[model samples]
Target: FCPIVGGLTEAALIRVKRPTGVKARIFISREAASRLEHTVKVKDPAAKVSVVQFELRQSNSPDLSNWARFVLVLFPESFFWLNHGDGISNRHAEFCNNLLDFMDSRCDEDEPDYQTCGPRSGDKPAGLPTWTNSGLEEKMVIKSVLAKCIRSENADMLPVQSDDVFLYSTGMMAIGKIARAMKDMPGDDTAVIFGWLYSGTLPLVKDSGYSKPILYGRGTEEELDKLESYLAAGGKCTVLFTEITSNPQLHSPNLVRIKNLADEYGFTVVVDDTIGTSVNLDILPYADVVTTSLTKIFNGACNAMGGSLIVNPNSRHYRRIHTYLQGHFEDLLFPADAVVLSENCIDYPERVKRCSATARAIAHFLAAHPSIDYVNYPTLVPSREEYERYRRDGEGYGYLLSIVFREPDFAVRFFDALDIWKGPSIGTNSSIALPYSVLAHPKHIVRLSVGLESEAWLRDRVTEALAKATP
Candidate 1:
């Protein structure tokens, strides 16, 4: 599952007798469940898979448990795909792993009070599901440290305070929380995705049931014109989502113009700056809410999974959006995970600077090579202007890039011969490459997540690999 799936594969059921220590229920949105259902079916036409909405209750009492929510059930054949699919949030994986560890420590004894009291009696839900407190003081310290670092990264570009930040167990959960908030708010329930987004995000919007998300795939001026025309023609959108700079393609949407449209049309704009990470780009000025995957470059050590959503105090919708988010906020990030992130991110600024410089060198080398067809980096993308407008003065184009080779054979040879760690997750302290074509489409493209290696050293690796790949 290391390269194929990025989460827990073992299945766990809440309130199940055999699987003891069932204190929390893993929640999955109805929309996400639907996507998982489709994936199972697509993998094997008759693969029996169905989702269940389980409400936990005390065996002796009639009260519904706070952990009650949606969960998926599948045949054993489809179980591995449960975590492999993009729809399953990593938060659920974190919960399952923690549960496994807790069970291991039980030493043949039933988890204390869980057997008699039932799953309902163990954890008290504050607002969102499965809310429990392990260490309040530690969580506070780590959260404050994260907020301070994020504010420093802002460099006075956007007004940021501790109050504006909310943390989640994983980046996907953070995005899902925003989707839930928007779903609950009073509106026509329509939202727009302004550009091509990460593979997992599209399903979040599609499942919204609010409306089929308006997708502007290219993030070009023509798409912007069409968006304005749609709004003028009586289209209603309550919220909009976009990445500051999209994954893989690295093109950015025109945030300046989009913000203007949002102002005129009274819709909220949410930006995921995970790819353009806060160290290199500050998007709070245009985005109503900025969601970042602290699991990425924010924690270069790649030891913990976390996410943060920061509300722009300057946005007109700040009061309403912030209130709803704050009310529903759950401190689900594990204390151990928080500690790892706190230590890993201590030198976040320096790590970002080093990775950015290395990525720029790699992107330039690929662009200049005769065997390379094209490169997709912020500086080389069609929407470079859009990205540059919000980029900090001294930052490079950030640590990620994608490239296509002139010949398919050359790409195969280069990738197979390249001496680098290749895997799924990005933003590590060491370079990682993945065949993007396998993930995105049939075409041969390699996506690189550069790391804190020396510029000349990384260059020589690529240079030698390309020479070996020469056709």
Candidate 2:
């Protein structure tokens, strides 16, 4: 006999309970009523529950000494659904228990026995499986490696899987392995290859025994055709590399055209997607080998350092290179630096969004400013015909921009007068300002990595700095 107390308030409930000569009383704390109001608003506007659960604490209620603790136990499934990987299955638990048993077997029976092998062998040793001991150690190693791989793989697939991806410590080690494997290739083999030769790739290129390393810089169709013709005319293994987007001025090479050229020339293409951060661009379909520095946008925090090489899984080169690196490469430290990267990687999309928004606003403001001689952003690169094409989908232009002052001293003045912390490194949560010549070279071109600061605030700061810089 449950009555639906819909829309029945405290006063209304009291009315029904009371009759002639019958006294009735209703009591509810203010906090309880507030909680009830909130719950009713969410559940059903008509619900009339007399009692409500109120979250109260002794600290908030200073007068109360003893506190009540309500333990709300939830099934594992409730939280387990939030996890994306299959590694969290019940089978893993049994595997973990077996691992404990193996470790227990290795413990020393006595203090002196720990330092020496037991005296069992005289002539021919009993053939117990050496793998029983070594196999356990290998399992530990593999578990750690796989854990890190899983974290990085997951980070790269965050938000909408279409966004960007990240790889932490061991993942970067895998990239170095790929680079080493390429170096190991027979010098005389006639293999067409495409490689992204950025600052990091420079060392690998110098060491690579390949006969000819082709240099591809950003230029017009005539220039690209010249490069294509050069490669077509009996060019040996070709290695093409460029800064995806150079710092100070964000310059992007023609990737789609390069992909076409690679297809035509029968060359494998590699791209350094570090600066692109995978968040800004998608190069996987076009590139055979994709390398990136996880230290930057992936870490989001300035502390950690790591890199990654993502190879096309279907390619024979990828399989061979991956296999070779797996055998020779020294594994990363246990519970590697990847844990920090994984936590930070989750916030990457939001950070990139804020940083890009701020940079675009700042670039537009500086471009229109009278004191500024030139603004070097991808969008502002007047010489490139593909500027609009590159900047399609509101991308191509990222958080970095360089400003050239009308007067040489203006660069110095602007850098000094800026209120924000002027320092090294880009993609930090706080905006950084530096004279490009002073920081990287020896001149006075100011470079700015616009961070997560408000556009209005940055605009005002730039205006103030520019006014101060002007004589």
Candidate 3:
């Protein structure tokens, strides 16, 4: 039962410290106290802890909401970023708000269980409503489909099954889950980030308190050699996280060599295959764990939010890793979100092919145009040979790419004149573009998420935009 703790005052804060021997009830805010009144009265009053409200001299500072002991600070400048970048799911918010409203109406009664507050059936497992059976049936279908989709280029590697797949409320949740699991594992607390990662993931690994991750800017063979040398000289690495293709830049890390290193050293490899979707890449054989953001190309409608982490059944660390995940796993993908994703996912293979075709055509156009400096697509990226090793049936390189301009003014001119859907999201049914530098990555580039449009039509639009961009 987590509730947002806030106050109407100028400042709000809640700090709690649990002593080993005694119970401490600290009320930092009146709003927290009022909200927890029922919990204190209905349950054990001794173990109850609530909120705090205080006035700060700098009242213009950001407001803080403490939920489940985790403090959430809302800053005005990054509010939009928070909403789109690693934000909570709409379904999660809907359930939370509904539960709070229910609690308000039934304040005098004992705390309502799942049957009263949300959806829960008598046959479901005993636990929180959201955790018990919120999306049980739907999740199984999604996992099963994903398992079938992800495979290996090497024919002999054991295939993954539905049980190996674990879904999360969002992509960021999946990434965080892997980091925490490795951090808590015994011995060898070393972690390495091999390439420029998703904007959300970069901070997750660096700020993860357990161990400072070894950072490598480019996911090049040279970087892997550096890591190999470290391992050779008795350096320890417990886990390494990397993207199949680095976001915005589209650089594919040398997973083949990374897998060989994992075999030699027994360190686990975690790869984010969100950019290189399962339909386009076979990564499970090389990486011990594969993470995907279902919100993107998987659900081309761009409506639902979800993610999946599939443990490689054949990895040497498979048993322990799967045990750790299964032991700690909680199903948070809401039923509504799962249903929409399932429907949207039906045509992912087709959509991926269609979008990839259009994306490749446009990428070629941009590469040849006078206004463009270069394009970052799997075919054009320096790691083309490495990406080809994992390519499935030579399906076109994914639906995403980025372009650099020969001149700074050209970048702005093209972006300004392009009459297309423009935003941070990728893999939608409609094409979208955003200035990468202004958004997450601070590069003077434009990233495009190609959609399922006619190659000829999209190429014409790019040509038209380039005409304006060229001096």
Candidate 4:
């Protein structure tokens, strides 16, 4: 899947074709090879693919799928990689050591080159700040930075104690790990996922061997109370996962009720603050673990991918869960990607500040528009008081909003009308619009991740789009 291959990574527009097909034995577990064989056969009936369904070797903790192939001359260890032409491999890379050898690795080790520039944004041309916590190992600097970010907003987290923070390549990976870390599998380790939170939740949980999730809806106290009673009365339940403000629909769960249930039932609660980023809301008090896809608002640059799982230290399962995470947390963030994240993160706080205001301005405009049917923002949410409870006093509700056009038929025109970067990610430097759940829940809903653009700028574009969409 490494660049299947083209697009941005390409240099010339001449449609130049270079080597693509790599040839080598792909090391994979019997199951995966069989799955791939089946997949390929389904598509091509006349094809011969050899998959030696033999046992493979392990590369070690948090390694890329023991069946994963990552190198060259270094192979004699287990198996090899399979590309069409010649396999790609690296021999210099030993076990990814805690490579702190690059202390001066900071992009600013020299002088800031203001005149020169690259595509990425920085303080200036060379404004990428080198961040590391001296009190902690460089290996632990990422953890410290993330922990500090969370604690900065929730000052109470300092003394009252908060969840131990762990980073993942993506938020979905964090959730899968949490699901995997459950004490028991399937039967005893049942997790309750509140509402249609993030689309990735169910598949990740199910894939990690959890029983079918017990689904609940947003702000449904009766359901929460009932589940709590069931568990309180010797029923089996391991965890509850919910988004502070659910995705697409922008629905915030009743955290108070959910937290209370978690406390009484002794089931760990997980809250996703990807949309209601740490900048705008403090969810540590209510959730045992707060997970976030830092790829979104936290980074805002839209280039880097990262996630974090903050464990509540004071939660009843702190000692056990913290140890569980320490053992399972993968050092998955790449050095280059880490640099991308650290650089972009410098401006996200400021980015969030601007995005929050712009999001509301756009939401308000849409709310007032005749063609706009509904606006779903934390501030405009029907359960406004609930979301506002944990919102830090000064911060705007959030930088995300979802809307539905009055004329569902015109939504396509409306969506096409607004000219902006259209994609799945949120919290970028520019606004991103998506046909919210255009597949299964296909409707007129459009999810907007407002970027740090001028309020007047965003307002003008969207207003004109609405005017154009009007019949």
Higher TM-score: candidate 1 or 4? 1
**What lDDT does the true structure give each of the candidates?**
0.69, 0.48, 0.69, 0.61
Per-residue CA lDDT of candidate 1, range 1-471, in tens?
Answer: 343332333334433332432222233445545665665576788664534443333322222232232353433332322122223335445543333322211111233322322233344433332333443454565566555644534455655777788877677767777877988988678878777554566775665455478777767889989989999998888988888778778888888899999999999998988778777876777888888787788888887777788887788989999999989776556555666676777788789889898898789889998898899998798888878888877887889999888888788899988898898778899998999555662278888999888998899889889888885
List candidate 1 segments past 4 Å from native: 1-138, 145-158
Superposition TM-score, candidate 2 onto the true structure = 0.58
TM-score of each: 0.77, 0.58, 0.77, 0.72
Tell me which of candidates 2 and 4 scores higher on TM-score: 4
Give lDDT: candidate 4, residue 264.
67
The Cα error of candidate 1 at residue 459, in Å, is: 1.2
lDDT of 3 by residue, 220-248 (tens): 88898899999999999889889887878
Instruction: State in Å the error of residue 37, model 3.
Output: 21
Model 3 — which ten-residue stretch has the worst lDDT? 61-70
* Each model's backbone clash number: 0, 6, 6, 12
Backbone collision tally, model 2 = 6
For model 2, how does the per-residue alpha-carbon lDDT over 37-86 read when each residue is reduced to its tens digit? 44344556544333211112212222111111111111111111110111
